[PDB]
Amino acid sequence: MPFHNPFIKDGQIKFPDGSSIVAHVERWAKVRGDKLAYRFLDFSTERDGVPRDLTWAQFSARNRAVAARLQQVTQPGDRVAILCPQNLDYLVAFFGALYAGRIAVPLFDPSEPGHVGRLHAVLDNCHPSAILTTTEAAEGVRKFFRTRPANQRPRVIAVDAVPDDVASTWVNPDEPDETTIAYLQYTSGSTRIPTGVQITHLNLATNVVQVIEALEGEEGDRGLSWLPFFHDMGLITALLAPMIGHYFTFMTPAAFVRRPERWIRELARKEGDTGGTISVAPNFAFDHAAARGVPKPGSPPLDLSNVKAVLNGSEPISAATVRRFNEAFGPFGFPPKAIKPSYGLAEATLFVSTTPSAEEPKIITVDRDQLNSGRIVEVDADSPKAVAQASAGKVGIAEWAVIVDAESATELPDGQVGEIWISGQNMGTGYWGKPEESVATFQNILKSRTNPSHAEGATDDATWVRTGDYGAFYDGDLYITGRVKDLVIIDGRNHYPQDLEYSAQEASKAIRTGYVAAFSVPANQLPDEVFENAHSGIKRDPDDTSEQLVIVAERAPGAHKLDIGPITDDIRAAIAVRHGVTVRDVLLTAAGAIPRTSSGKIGRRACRAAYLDGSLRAGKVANDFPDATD
Amino acid sequence: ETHINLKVSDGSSEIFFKIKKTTPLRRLMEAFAKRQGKEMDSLRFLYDGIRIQADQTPEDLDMEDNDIIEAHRE
Ligand SMILES: Nc1ncnc2c1ncn2[C@@H]1O[C@H](COP(=O)(O)OP(=O)(O)OP(=O)(O)O)[C@@H](O)[C@H]1O
Ligand SMILES: [Mg+2]
């Protein structure tokens, strides 16, 4: 009766023939075709929702029909972009592409607001031969592609109009090998243009097993999500079902935002539950549900003592977020251990590490001076040197993470900060259309290990992925300190931008957390206003290329307008006093000026590029991603 | 070859045509329209569930020999 993972034999992941996710769906369709597989909670008409269900047999029939059509109008190796709204047909489209032996590219309905830049970027990278959408979304799709070049408007298919009987000619693709790409997982584009990780069927099945292992997932554990399927975390949670054997329930992000209690109520114990709910949540989901999702006084009873796991990722978990969610939902039986901080990224399919099931989220405070010098040392939370670091827990099975001095490719002792490199069969096989970056990122050799080593279990000729993150192992746990490309290096000293950004928002009322970015630029690329300002502390020199600190922040929409003078003064003094670095320029913009990512987070390299070009200054619309040369 | 065979169906009447890939589907649509006793704008024509315009050609739509056009009202 302890947890046994059916896909693991002697600590190893074993896949017989027919272990691709397509084979698993077809298997369920055969042995229990009438069993519920996928449920979409449709809130478009009914406020309380209308469940739309698909059994395994029904799911299979739709997948094979779409796949058969796809095999008539596309070639092996072609990419097929999914531009469906988030509903059952999105999954039919995605699986249909897999069933067809084509490379799925999960995107979104172009009618969705704000995301058009990402859509162009992905289409310019992977060039799909077919677009899958629905009849409802078809017109918006047509209109979107009118904004693409005439030779960039691939054929469009509405998957809900493809008849069942089309499936009769479907050909099951051959058993995939470890090079057979199933789909592209695009990165969030935090430090660059979104890049497409090549996820194989082996990658996918492996990481599903790794997630099942990490969560101790059972067939009675209902899966639940509101996340977009084009997000890293959104997709994999929806793909557990054919292997774990639960049914998966989802809603749109807009539905969650409008009424977060909808998610809370689905998390809760249902009559007939024989397991615990598994879901997924960025910090925002916790924050929003805590503030807008607590049942009103007099509401029906709410029991959250059943929840097994809410996987938290894409970011470090916040201590305040954890406090607020448990204060809000603890009275309803929510188990603090259900919050699972985790480390993940597209390059690993998704999942790398999380807490053991016994444990609660761990957030420590470390010494700023030691941290900036590359070492982790704990200090009291009330110390003026305190910097918060969130544990991402333990590396998963058949997977490895090591902390490394990148230049020499040698493992560092615990407590020391370096590049996180990772290895495992869940690691993607490259970036689409970027062969050189693929070699540099995915094909690294670990030249030297410590004793003991976090690479223990990996072959010595194993290939290692450069995550682009700084981090460390400390007291048994993995911590991510920041992004390599974002590290602010000025006058021979290191500064973490989020640490600088936190000081800036603390210094001024006009500076809001999440609406400020810190980065450096060469001195001679600074705008003229800087050199003409007395308080900047720097004057023009065409040969001065030394890195200088820049802060860019947004004001609230409205409440126009206050003097930038005392705002700049407050920020400059506060950062100098705490960090010993002097900001050379503080630029304030209107709301929505600063380029952001999928998640809705500031992309610092893109903010930097838009500062330097200089869009933000004159109020121009800023490019959502940095140039490929950045 | 320069021609393809196209089959149009409204759920009952399954009528076959032949047309040059460069020829607008207008004449083909109107031909099917009245053999059903209806007029053209009383019908919508779909190819893979996507609405066709009358001045679009098979070549514009990457149609192949023996493709199906489904005809609905509205
Ligand atoms: N527990 C965590 N703590 C801190 N950061 C995290 C955590 N989990 C994920 N992240 C951040 O999210 C990243 C994964 O994001 P994703 O793969 O979607 O693209 P991205 O790295 O944000 O964008 P790009 O690769 O284009 O710069 C990780 O590399 C890490 O930087
Ligand atoms: Mg990344």
Author numbering:
A (entry chain A): 1 to 630
B (entry chain B): 21 to 94
Quoted from the paper:
We observed one molecule of MsFadD32 and one molecule of SUMO in the asymmetric unit of the crystal structure of ATP-bound MsFadD32, with a critical crystal contact mediated by SUMO. Structural comparisons with other adenylating enzymes reveal that ATP-bound MsFadD32 exists in the adenylate-forming conformation. However, the invariant Lys601 in motif A10 located in the C-terminal domain does not point into the active site and interact with ATP but forms a charge-stabilized hydrogen bond with Glu315 located in the N-terminal subdomain B. In the MsFadD32-ATP complex, ATP sits in a cleft at the interface between the N- and C-terminal domains, and the residues involved in ATP binding are all from the large N-terminal domain. The three phosphate groups of ATP are held in place mainly by the P-loop27 residues (Thr187–Arg192 of motif A3). There is a hydrophobic tunnel in the ATP-bound MsFadD32 structure at the opposite side of the phosphate tail of ATP. Phe284 is located at the entrance of the putative pantetheine-binding tunnel of MsFadD32.
FadD32 is one of the 34 FadD proteins of M. tuberculosis annotated as putative fatty acyl-CoA synthetases, and its role in mycolic acid biosynthesis is to activate C48–C64 meromycolic acid for condensation by PKS1313. FadD32 belongs to the adenylating enzyme superfamily that includes acyl-CoA synthetases, the adenylation domains of nonribosomal peptide synthetases, and firefly luciferases. These enzymes consist of two domains and catalyze two half-reactions: an adenylate-forming reaction which leads to formation of acyl-AMP from a carboxylate substrate and ATP, and a thioester-forming reaction which leads to formation of acyl-CoA from acyl-AMP and CoA or formation of acyl-ACP from acyl-AMP and ACP15. Although FadD32 was initially found to catalyze only the first half-reaction and was named fatty acyl-AMP ligase (FAAL), later evidence demonstrated that it is a bifunctional enzyme: during mycolic acid biosynthesis FadD32 catalyzes both the formation of meromycoloyl-AMP from meromycolic acid and ATP and the subsequent acyl chain transfer from meromycoloyl-AMP to the phosphopantetheinyl arm of the N-terminal ACP domain of PKS131617.
